[PDB]
């Protein structure tokens, strides 16, 4: 019935799962009983380690005092898995106990080419700064992390390199903004576009987004009948749309969020940001935009003499609900005076 109820040399009922050899009889009492077991005796006769116990048996143990130890033969002489998970650590804690040494030479190998290149700490505590995320429970694991690779280092060696200052590395990510020029190159050869600018209730008409100012749902958006080559959706309350000769060419059109599927991939939204210039500021404004669903195309930024920075975000955003929420995501620091577009 999945368990054996065996007896100890006193005569107490020892509740263990079924199929147990007398090696499994040891670890219910104490783990060092398994460290010192030689043989076994059940009911007068010695029994072999090849014997599997039955429910209701008195098991006497031939135990050395402190002299003897395990082998590789015992690692499959553990039938019951919960006692075998002790056996998964039993033969481990004498082999890995040796392998703290090969851990120690190779844990301290991987540090100084990645971490103690620049730290140079003696006596070291930076390798023991991973005593807060990993369940070390003592210093044995932090020194034998590679001796078994149950911790699987270059994860914990990357925890050594967790120091992410990244001021030049954001300028390296400003170079990513330099290298991303080529996202307009999928805007030859067509782009996946719906009827998104609904032209006065009439669909399927040639319109284009205005480069004077970007058509977004702030003020309403108006299509100007050009002489040709397209129709510009000039985003009313623009200085170009207000000074129009031939007002008949302006057409009241729709931004068309009313359809089945809204436009998932609107883009080209440039944002003017006037913030006060301090240190540790320009990276963090890029960091709130980081991990937010927003692609950055141009980082044009400068600060005056009086350190009120005039920076610009020619970025990508898709909805006015996506815009105005992210508009209230440049304001996490409160050093920034205002924001425009």
């Amino acid at each position: 019935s999945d368990m054996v109820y065996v007896f100890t040399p006193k005569g107490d009922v020892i509740e263990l799962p079924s199929g147990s050899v007398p090696i499994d009889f040891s670890y219910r009492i104490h783990s060092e009983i398994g460290n010192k077991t030689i043989g076994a005796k059940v009911n007068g006769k010695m029994v072999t380690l090849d014997h599997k116990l039955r429910t209701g048996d008195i098991v006497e143990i031939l135990t050395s005092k402190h002299s003897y130890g395990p082998s590789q033969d015992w690692v499959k002489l553990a039938q019951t898995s919960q006692a075998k998970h002790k056996i998964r650590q039993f033969f481990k804690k004498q082999r890995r106990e040796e392998n703290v040494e090969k851990g120690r030479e190779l844990v301290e190998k991987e540090i100084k080419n990645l971490d103690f290149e620049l730290k140079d700490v003696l006596t070291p505590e930076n390798i023991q700064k991973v005593a807060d995320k990993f369940n070390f429970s003592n210093e044995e694991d932090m020194y034998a992390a590679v001796g078994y690779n149950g911790i699987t280092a270059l994860q914990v060696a990357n925890r050594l390199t967790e120091k992410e200052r990244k001021q030049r590395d954001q300028e390296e990510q400003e170079k990513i903004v330099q290298e991303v020029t080529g996202e307009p190159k999928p805007y030859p050869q067509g782009r996946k576009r719906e009827a998104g600018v609904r032209v006065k209730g009439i669909d399927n008409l040639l319109v284009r987004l205005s480069k004077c100012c970007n058509p977004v749902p702030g003020d309403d958006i108006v299509g100007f009948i050009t002489k040709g080559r397209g129709v510009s959706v000039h985003r009313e309350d623009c200085p170009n749309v207000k000074t129009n000769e031939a007002q008949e060419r302006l057409i009241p059109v729709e931004w068309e969020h009313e359809s089945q599927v809204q436009k998932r991939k609107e883009y080209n939204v440039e944002i003017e940001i006037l913030g006060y210039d301090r240190r540790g500021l320009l990276n963090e404004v890029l960091q709130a935009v980081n991990e937010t669903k927003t692609n950055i195309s141009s980082v044009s930024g400068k600060s005056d003499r009086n350190k009120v920075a005039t920076i610009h975000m020619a970025i990508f955003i898709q909805n006015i609900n996506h815009l105005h929420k992210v508009v209230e995501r440049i304001k996490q620091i409160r050093d920034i005076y205002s924001v425009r577009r």
Partner: protein, 135 residues
Amino acid sequence: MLLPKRVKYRREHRGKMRGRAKGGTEVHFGEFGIQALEASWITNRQIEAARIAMTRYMKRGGKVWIKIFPSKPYTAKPLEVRMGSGKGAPEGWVAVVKPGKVLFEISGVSEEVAREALRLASHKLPIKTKFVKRE
């Protein structure tokens, strides 16, 4: 660094600091100013630390109106060099400040700001200060 763009001479004599201020003796382009009460040199380093502490406290500055400017340069030798053998290379800059000289101003912000604003800049100058309103 408020650096002058092109100066007639790289190096000048160090001058003697006697007399009152010629001009800049009363705040008039703002309403809350700061006269110095003593006389020493003031560098671009002593204006950078001055001008930063102006706007960190105000959090929205109207204007600042930095009056003085580092006109006169100054030189020293490279270190561990025996005397003589040429006046050294120009190293920093000096704003020549007589006592009673209006240093900074505050444009249109309240007194309890301004009493605390020019306080936080007075500990970046080597000169005792006082608080002067517009008259």
